[PDB]
């Protein structure tokens, strides 16, 4: 006559066993992006001009002190490294990563993209269907900047390469019932994205990975959603009167 | 369609309720005073009395009881029955009812229009009386 239920599940963060960890957490990546390259506000009208864009980009790469300091750290720690070959590799990483999102293959996606990026591109889309194709690259991929984070604790250095790329992509997102949600499959829409890459140096296995995606503050508003959406007003208890701002 | 319940009063304003009431009651007075003169309208043929014949009845209202005395000295108790508004309503002929005797239908006291049923209200409409209880 005396028996009780079990299993009330709880998540308790407590700092004491978190400190007593005998094998401290090993990170392949760092969560942030150290220095965010902030692009020209007229970067749309200089993109239709070839030898304006190419010139100013290459110029800003060669002229910067920090850029070539870091490129020197990477070259010295990692031999047979070239800046002129890299936007090719980066582009390929991009194409394969999103072509992974199509097939929903996470194993390869863990080789390509970084730990900070993966939650973002995978999370929301897991119960949906994605069809994404690469059609054109309008302006060949440009290397904007390079940076390094020196952790004096681990002696660990992470090369972070920002590649600006201008692209032609087709994106269609389907809902879990198979009914279209985001955008058409027939429109080769034009995209401009600033893609940060990261690599662990001291690591012997040394993968070049896709770290983050930076959006500019002036960026063209993304294409509209299909469905209509409602945004509720503040939920009121009985005695609380409503107040309207102007 | 989930159509909600409704009563006669529901959508009327405070202004209109006294009005509606006046309307109904006044038309009641009119209608009752109109049929007040039967013999000058179109009375059905009156027949003399045959031996095996039987009259119509009434519908009354039990008031209360009262004592009453008889010249022999005895005491009786009586019931007061008041006829309030009594009208014959319809007529079913002999062959249509029992095959023996005709059937008259008789109404009792007047009631509100609002709380009866559409069918019944139609019935009295084509008559020209107010509804009987």
């Amino acid at each position: 006559s005396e028996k009780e239920f079990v299993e009330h599940a709880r998540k308790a963060g407590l700092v004491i066993p978190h400190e007593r960890l005998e094998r401290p957490i090993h990170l392949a990546c760092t969560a942030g992006i150290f220095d965010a390259y902030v692009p020209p506000e007229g970067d749309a009208r200089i993109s239709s001009l070839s030898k304006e864009g190419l010139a100013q980009r290459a110029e800003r790469l060669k002229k910067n002190v920090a850029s070539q300091l870091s490129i020197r750290k990477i070259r010295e720690s990692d031999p047979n490294f070239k800046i002129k070959d890299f936007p090719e590799k980066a582009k390929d990483i991009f194409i394969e990563a999103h072509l992974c999102l199509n097939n929903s293959d996470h194993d390869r996606l863990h080789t390509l993209v970084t730990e900070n990026c993966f939650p973002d591109m995978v999370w929301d889309i897991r119960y949906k269907t994605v069809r994404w194709s690469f059609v054109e690259s309008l302006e060949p991929p440009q290397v904007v900047q390079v940076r390094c984070s020196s952790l004096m604790n681990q002696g660990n250095i992470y090369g972070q390469v920002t590649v600006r790329m201008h692209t032609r992509q087709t994106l269609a997102i389907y809902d879990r019932f198979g009914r279209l949600m985001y955008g058409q499959e027939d429109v080769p829409r034009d995209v401009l994205e600033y893609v940060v890459f990261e690599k662990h140096l001291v690591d012997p296995y040394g993968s070049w990975r896709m770290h983050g995606k930076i959006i500019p503050p002036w960026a063209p508003p993304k294409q509209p959603i299909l469905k209509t959406v409602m945004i509720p007003g503040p939920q009121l208890k009985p005695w609380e009167e409503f107040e309207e701002p102007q | 369609h989930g159509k909600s319940v409704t009563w006669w009063d529901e959508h009327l304003s405070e202004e209109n309720v006294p009005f509606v009431k006046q309307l109904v009651s006044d038309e009641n007075k009119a209608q009752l005073a109109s049929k007040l003169c039967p013999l000058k309208d179109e009375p059905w043929p009156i027949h003399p009395w045959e031996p095996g014949s039987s009259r119509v009845g009434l519908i009354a209202l039990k008031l209360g009881m009262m004592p009453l005395w008889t010249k022999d000295g005895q005491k009786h108790v009586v019931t007061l029955l008041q006829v309030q508004d009594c009208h014959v309503l319809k007529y079913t002929p002999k062959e249509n009812h029992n095959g023996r005797m005709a059937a008259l239908t008789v109404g009792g006291k007047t009631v509100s229009h609002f709380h009866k049923s559409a069918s019944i209200l139609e019935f009295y409409q084509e008559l020209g009386l107010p509804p009987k209880q």
Binding site: S1, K3, F5, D175, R176, F177, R179, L180, M181, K227 | -
Partner: protein, 166 residues
């Protein structure tokens, strides 16, 4: 125990070829191990079958049953799930497809009697299941017309065969 109903939301369909009819959304949701009885709960669950979700919420709002408020909370959660997680415009566009009560795991206790006798008593639990579908509520069936009955009777007369006959 068995938890299945929960996984029904995790199904993904293959995308719709254009020209085919748009598939209506389906949201499965439930609440486990409620302190209500299973049967008492069944009445409530039965009441709101096939009602538009707003109608159901309205009806539940005024019920005096303890279970009423539980089911109401479950319906609200289901609504918000439907708009947020699955993709449904018009949160008023849902109706109740399936609504039902299962039995949960019971606790056993003593119930004392007299003359030192006892009965054995069960603290009772239950589950409430609901499945919402996107669209207007399907029309309630009108009972058979005289015409329909007569048709069926005739058709039956007409189906007759000479029996054991050849």
């Amino acid at each position: 125990i068995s938890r299945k109903w929960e996984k029904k939301n995790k199904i993904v369909y293959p995308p719709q070829l254009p020209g085919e009819p748009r598939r209506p959304a389906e949201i499965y949701h439930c609440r486990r191990q409620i302190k209500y009885s299973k049967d008492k709960m069944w009445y409530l669950a039965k009441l709101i079958r096939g009602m538009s979700i707003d109608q159901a919420l309205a009806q539940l709002e005024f019920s005096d049953k303890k279970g009423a408020q539980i089911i109401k909370e479950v319906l609200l959660e289901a609504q918000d799930m439907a708009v947020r997680d699955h993709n449904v415009e018009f949160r008023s566009n849902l109706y109740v497809a399936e609504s039902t009560s299962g039995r949960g795991q019971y606790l056993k206790r003593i119930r004392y009697h007299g003359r030192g006798r006892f009965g054995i008593m069960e603290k009772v639990f239950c589950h409430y299941f609901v499945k919402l579908v996107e669209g207007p509520p399907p029309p309630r069936e009108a009972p058979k017309t005289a015409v329909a009955h007569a048709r069926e009777y005739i058709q039956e007369l007409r189906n007759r065969t000479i029996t054991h006959a050849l």
